[PDB]
Design a protein around this ligand. Structure first.
Ligand SMILES: [K+]
Ligand SMILES: [K+]
Ligand SMILES: [K+]
Ligand SMILES: [K+]
Ligand SMILES: [K+]
Ligand SMILES: [K+]
Ligand SMILES: [Mg+2]
Ligand SMILES: [Mg+2]
Ligand SMILES: [Mg+2]
Ligand SMILES: [Mg+2]
Ligand SMILES: [Mg+2]
Ligand SMILES: [Mg+2]
Ligand SMILES: [Mg+2]
Ligand SMILES: [Zn+2]
Lengths: 108, 53, 50, 154, 143, 86
RNA sequence: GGUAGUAGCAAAUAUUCAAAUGAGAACUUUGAAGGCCGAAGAGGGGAAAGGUUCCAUGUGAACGGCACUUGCACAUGGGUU
RNA sequence: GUCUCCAAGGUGAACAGCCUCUGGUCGAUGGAACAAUGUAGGCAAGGGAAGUCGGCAAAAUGGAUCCGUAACUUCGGGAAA
RNA sequence: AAACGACUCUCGGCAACGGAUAUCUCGGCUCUCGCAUCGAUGAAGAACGUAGCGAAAUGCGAUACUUGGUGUGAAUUGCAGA
């Protein structure tokens, strides 16, 4: 199915005691695995803006919690091995902040 | 396709470093079609090749 | 170097001309035994020693 | 060409082979040993799983210093196994060629099984390394010949 | 020491020409079966029987055995439990076997009647300074 | 430092191509060839190197003029004449 | 041959995301981000030494101690006023 | 290992160390885990050379301003005592 | 229950690796014989060029894998053309 949701990901606990030079690439891999587990899709594409946000504070200072939007879409390409793929983009943080924010369904 | 020649010629024509040359990622075919400094100058005039600040 | 003598330059020209593969039609000659150019030279492998 | 083992009924069999393949002879032998006497579809699935790192080829003869995994438990009790993707790819290509030959011959692929498969050493190719104290050492590769014949069950 | 210093320098003499079983060698450490003797039961807390609580005659604060924030890595004790002097084998959550003594306990230590005066229930996940969450809330003015 | 480090300093040619024998044996500072002793009038040759003698002896080259001597001797060095017209 | 698919591949801070091409992309090209050289440089030229390694196009095999669509490799052309 | 020319901003005495601009570059085969033993780099309560052939190694001191500076001396120094 | 399999070893068929063996030979080695002919009228050697398509070998010298005379008498040849 085609479903869009917004999640909060705790990268702090996932990257606890991660070597500095691999912390941000490990965060990228962490987000990819999170999307894979959440949406059931092996093929996950990380938006350039989300990559920018992850890397915005260098290779060490990955944000503790990140608000992402994961959208599962049907792959139009016929030569693709997977019928569906996941797209991970940034999500807007409410004024009150991340406190009290759960998983949300975006699709109308 | 490879645009190494275009990058080098654009840097030479703009009199800037190769790291300050911007080749439009959406105009790859027409940029690759250029193989002379005159073509590079035409592309620069058209705006497909820009010197970054 | 950029500064080179005329004789050395001519010798290098001859070496460049000699550094090439054999013509293909040589292999079709009657009673041919030449398989390839056994005297090929590469600037990094064997130096001319001039 | 004459294979090491000829099929009992050549009319109901196909063959494939490759010579001087640029792949490690020992890994290729391990893969062939794992594959012997298996149905064609099961062999294809097994090789695909090996490529995906879901099943492991048990390393049995050339196993000195090989690690152990739980994936090869059912085949090799000691658990010594690996995932030689290069050898698996080459053998899968040979199997595809054999299946195409069977299709041309008119055999039905459902009951095909690997009647015979063999790996031999080919001519070694030479490179070199540089060792301490101005010494030079051989740096050789070990290509292999591979042959296989599929037969119709029963 | 060239080649490292965390070793046994000499692992044996020339003769016998073999390493013996008595020489220290590197290998598995921990996860060994053990039987420890003479652990004294300091209390027997029975669920719902005014003995599960950590209250004593001296200290009358109404509190339970579980420390503030729960037992680290274990949880909340609610069933019957034994308070034993000293330490016991294994990490937290490990199943342990309690065995009746095989010896005749006649020593003064074994016969001693111990009366608990205070049982600490402060948080063990840090330098706990409060015995109860209610006490902490009173201290911080949130109740 | 007498090995690999020392080998890094090689950019002054002791020898260059010899005008006479063509070998890279012309000692520049001595201004003389270690192979043929150019510019000395006589060629440098020694009997204690038969291999060196046979590498450069007569016959190893072209023999532009010498090769034709036997034919002229066989004709007795006949000159100033031609075969009878056809 | 055994050794043995073993010893090893570890200095010079570091890569990541999207797209293009391609049978095949961690390694080719474009863009974006995050880093390094920090002007007695990992920048820009010369002397010696080398001799075509320079530039364009294309690429079976070998080589580039993994890999390559790639290249100081290979093949065909051009270039030093 | 191999001669030489050019040489920005900040801090700072300083072509010291550290960061940055132009220019260059991420080229050192990659992935997973974080056992012993190693290599490189730290910390460690109380004691303070008891270690060891031997204070080996490490630690301690360190810039600038002010006060002050002994024996001895070839009268110059010692002295940053 | 030490059976089936794996490993090691061993024997046999086949297939590999390698180039021994056998049969060859426009080459070598040895003996014997005939002749006497390099160069300032520029030798030997050394360099560079030269073919429609050649790098080497062989040949040749800007008349450059050959010019001319004579003999023989229908080719050269890997391809193309004359
Ligand atoms: K192992
Ligand atoms: K390609
Ligand atoms: K001491
Ligand atoms: K002593
Ligand atoms: K056999
Ligand atoms: K003639
Ligand atoms: Mg080496
Ligand atoms: Mg604690
Ligand atoms: Mg002189
Ligand atoms: Mg300077
Ligand atoms: Mg180039
Ligand atoms: Mg200043
Ligand atoms: Mg023979
Ligand atoms: Zn000479």
């Amino acid at each position: 199915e085609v479903v869009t949701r917004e999640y909060t990901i705790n990268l702090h606990k996932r990257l606890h005691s991660c070597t500095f030079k691999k912390k941000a690439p490990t965060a990228i891999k962490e987000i990819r695995k999170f999307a894979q587990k959440a949406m059931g899709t092996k093929d996950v594409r990380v938006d350039v803006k989300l990559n920018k946000q992850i890397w915005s504070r260098g290779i060490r200072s990955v944000p503790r919690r990140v608000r992402v939007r994961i959208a599962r879409k049907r792959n139009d390409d016929e030569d693709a091995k997977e019928e569906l793929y996941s797209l991970v983009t940034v999500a807007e943080i409410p004024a009150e902040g991340l406190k009290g924010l759960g998983t949300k369904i975006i699709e109308d | 396709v490879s645009l190494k020649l275009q990058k080098r010629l654009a840097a030479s024509v703009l009199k800037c470093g190769r790291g300050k040359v911007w080749l439009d990622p959406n105009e790859g075919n027409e940029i690759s079609m250029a193989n002379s400094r005159q073509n590079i100058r035409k592309l620069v005039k058209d705006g497909f090749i820009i010197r970054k600040p | 170097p950029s500064h080179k003598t005329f004789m050395i330059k001519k010798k290098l020209a001859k070496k460049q001309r000699q550094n090439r593969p054999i013509p293909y039609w040589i292999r079709m000659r009657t009673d041919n035994t030449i398989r390839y150019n056994a005297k090929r030279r590469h600037w990094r492998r064997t130096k001319l020693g001039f | 060409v004459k294979y090491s083992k000829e099929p009992d009924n050549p009319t109901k069999s196909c063959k494939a082979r490759g010579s001087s393949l640029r792949v490690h002879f020992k890994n290729t032998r391990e893969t062939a040993h794992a594959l012997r006497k298996m149905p064609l579809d099961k062999a294809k699935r097994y090789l695909e799983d090996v490529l995906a790192h879901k099943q492991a080829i048990p390393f049995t003869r050339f196993c000195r210093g090989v690690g152990r995994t739980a994936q090869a438990k059912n085949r090799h009790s000691s658990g010594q196994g690996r995932w030689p993707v290069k050898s698996t790819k080459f053998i899968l290509d040979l199997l595809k060629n054999a299946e195409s030959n069977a299709d041309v011959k008119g055999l039905d692929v459902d009951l095909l099984f690997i009647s015979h498969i063999q790996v031999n050493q080919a001519q070694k190719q030479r490179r070199r390394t540089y060792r301490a104290h101005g010494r030079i050492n051989p740096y050789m590769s070990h290509p292999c010949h591979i042959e296989l014949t599929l037969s119709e069950k029963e | 020491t060239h080649r490292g210093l965390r070793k046994v320098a000499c692992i044996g003499a020339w003769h016998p020409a073999r390493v013996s079983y008595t020489v220290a060698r590197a290998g598995q450490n921990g996860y060994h079966h053990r039987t420890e003797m003479n652990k004294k039961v300091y209390k027997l807390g029975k669920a719902g029987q005014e003995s599960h609580a950590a209250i004593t005659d001296f200290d009358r604060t109404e509190k339970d055995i579980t420390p503030m924030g729960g037992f680290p890595h274990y949880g909340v004790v609610k069933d019957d439990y034994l308070l034993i002097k000293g330490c016991c084998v294994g990490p937290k959550k490990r199943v342990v076997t309690l065995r009746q003594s095989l010896l005749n306990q006649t020593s003064r230590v074994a016969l001693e009647e111990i009366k608990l005066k205070f049982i600490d229930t402060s948080s063990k996940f840090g330098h706990g300074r409060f015995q109860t969450t209610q006490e902490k809330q009173k201290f911080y003015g949130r109740l | 430092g007498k090995g690999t480090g020392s080998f890094g300093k090689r950019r002054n040619k002791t020898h260059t191509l010899c005008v006479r024998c063509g070998r890279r044996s012309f000692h520049i500072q001595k201004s003389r060839c270690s192979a043929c002793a150019y510019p000395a009038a006589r060629l440098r040759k020694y009997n204690w190197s038969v291999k060196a003698l046979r590498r450069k002896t007569t016959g190893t080259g072209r023999m532009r003029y010498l090769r034709n001597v036997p034919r002229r001797f066989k004709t007795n060095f006949r000159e100033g004449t031609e075969a009878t017209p056809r």
